[PDB]
Design a protein around this ligand. Structure first.
Ligand code: KNU
Ligand code: KNU
Lengths: 304, 304
């Protein structure tokens, strides 16, 4: 037992990290098969970032201007193209460590692991969720651009995020591996503000089920509620509305614990209205929302 | 910017995980060079665990009774020995993926990453601290025995923990890689209780410095204190006493932020006495103590 914010083992992704340099700008790239993916702003100077015309800046770049280094060895770039906000650099060598992979575009509320990298070298791994305002709260310093987010289904890595930028409020924005930003963000040094960062209700419920499985049961109340009644309280507290799709996904946790989904909603409603009163749940003094129902099942069952 | 509970990239350790089976008992082993390390209770039945005599149970075991599987291939065991609470199985093949490594015995308050494994296969990675009562609060299910804790200094893995057991209160106990338990725990199914789980004061201070670096400054107060005065409050709140050695280690964070260590102690004293008043620091409603001063420096500087 015990419940931790756990990331996927990062080895399969570490084997894909490379350094990409264009002129004086260096960031990370993801090398899968014979293609290196990286943020297109690798072609920009600090001045270019204020109002970049990427197609125009790219005209001044040839294959030899992109320096790709894997470990301490240079890869030969034989092609390059821009797809949305990412560049795809075709190299002459397939990555021998390419895992089985997919590119997926996730929904808000979904979680993933980030392998933060600098100069193509991994520094650490942590667990994130795509916030309902399409930002992530990561840990990214200058040069972390190009670090990726992913999930693993046994031996298949599903890449869902590539880091591009930090908003003036310190939250993060990036794209899927097709180069499309999550949310309305653009890769430009212009002030962009995030919308309301609401709480991912289905994830808090999943985490309350993890708490019961792990022996933290004090918050269990004697009430039940309905979706409509719960959602009136969710709205007041800036929680995401709960739908029958979320109730369906919590079914296995409801089955394992014998606690009906709506009863757990009623316990959450009381926690929102009464607060924690200085108590903790799974060592947290706030309601955690960065575990999906699948994450809780996975961690409580021991999937490898 | 942003500050996350970050684990070391786990690839170097994933390449060392194997499955060890003795009779009907299966757990994880760590394969480094031509030796596989695993908890000695791999030789026990459930009945043996109530009062095991390990030297006696080991007399009934030969090299061929230990089945070691790396991926889906069997390793040949050519020797075996018991060192404290671990078995060392000499195999005929050196692990080709053996990273540069050391075995270290950590002090309470020190943090490390755990690669939780089942059947020799990695399930996830998370960050722990050795608690002041020599337990860790991990996430370990049946079969996680043998999973290891480690730190990385660039390309050298320092293994500090091997998981052995869960106390009846759901906290975890294990050994260093020489088989010596942290704390007073024994590898027997007998009720063993943990001592006071005090808060690692030097780590909370480090995390308050991380909060200031990352823009969370509301808790900064207009006071200072002395070590003796602070420690009177630390004692009352079950925090570890702060020594000049801890002040010395916080020096670089004090230098980077311009906040004297004793002034940060005074801000922590006010947080202990006043509480958070419903506010958060780095997204937490409690004072986090599982980041050392070195972890904060590393994460805020981008070490790979
Ligand atoms: C990774 C990162 O933060 N890159 C910087 C240079 C940046 C700034 C900016 F205004 C927009 C983008 Cl996409 C990237
Ligand atoms: C990894 C684990 O929990 N192993 C179990 C079988 C166990 C039980 C016990 F009472 C003592 C030890 Cl060391 C291990």
């Amino acid at each position: 037992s015990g419940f931790r914010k756990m990331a996927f083992p990062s080895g399969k992704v570490e084997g894909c990290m490379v350094q990409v340099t264009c002129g004086t700008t260096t960031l990370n790239g993801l090398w899968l098969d014979d293609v290196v993916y990286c943020p297109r702003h690798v072609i920009c100077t600090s001045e270019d970032m204020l109002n970049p015309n990427y197609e125009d800046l790219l005209i001044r770049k040839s294959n030899h201007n992109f320096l790709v280094q894997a470990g301490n060895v240079q890869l030969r770039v034989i092609g390059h193209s821009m797809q949305n906000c990412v560049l795809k650099l075709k190299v002459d060598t397939a990555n021998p460590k390419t895992p089985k992979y997919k590119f997926v575009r996730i929904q808000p509320g979904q979680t993933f692991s980030v392998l933060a990298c600098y100069n193509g070298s991994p520094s650490g791994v942590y667990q994130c969720a795509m916030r309902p305002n399409f930002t992530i709260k990561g840990s990214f310093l200058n040069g972390s651009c190009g670090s990726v987010g992913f999930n693993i289904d046994y031996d298949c890595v599903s890449f869902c995020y590539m880091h591009h930028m930090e908003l003036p409020t310190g939250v993060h924005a990036g794209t899927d591996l097709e180069g499309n930003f999550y949310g309305p963000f653009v890769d430009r040094q212009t002030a962009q503000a995030a919308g309301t960062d609401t709480t991912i209700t289905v994830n808090v419920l999943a985490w309350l089920y993890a708490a019961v499985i792990n022996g933290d049961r004090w918050f269990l109340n004697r009430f039940t509620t309905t979706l409509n009644d719960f959602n009136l309280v969710a709205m007041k507290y800036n929680y995401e509305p709960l739908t029958q799709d979320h109730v369906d996904i919590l079914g296995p946790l409801s089955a394992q614990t014998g606690i009906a989904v709506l009863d757990m909603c009623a316990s959450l409603k009381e926690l929102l209205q009464n607060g924690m009163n200085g108590r903790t749940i799974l060592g947290s003094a706030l309601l955690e929302d960065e575990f999906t129902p699948f994450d809780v099942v996975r961690q409580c069952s021991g999937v490898t």
